[PDB]
């Protein structure tokens, strides 16, 4: 057939819209990858430092408070 080559004309969408799935089955996974590996080992971790930040305060805000009571209790 001069009706054959139509199929010998798949090579377009079904090879190129496929060379398309590629950068969409790659790159769109690759982001979900990145976009997670990022924060899921960032966001919640710098926030280990939300924890560091407290004690500093505590251990060194009670710092200030003592140095009231001493004062306040040398007085008439």
């Amino acid at each position: 057939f001069e009706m054959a080559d139509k199929l010998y004309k798949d090579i377009c969408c079904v090879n190129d819209s496929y060379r398309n799935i590629k950068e969409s089955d790659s790159s769109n996974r690759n982001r979900v990858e990145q976009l997670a590996r990022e924060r899921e080992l960032l966001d919640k971790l710098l926030e280990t430092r939300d924890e560091r930040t407290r004690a500093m305060m505590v251990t060194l805000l009670n710092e200030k408070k003592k140095k009231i009571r001493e004062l306040h209790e040398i007085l008439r």
């Binding site: 407290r54 305060m57 505590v58 805000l61 009670n62 408070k65 009231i68 009571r69």
Partner: peptide, 11 residues
């Protein structure tokens, strides 16, 4: 207060 203030919870 100016107690002995705090615990990391009491914050």
């Amino acid at each position: 207060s100016f107690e002995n203030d705090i615990s990391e919870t009491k914050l």
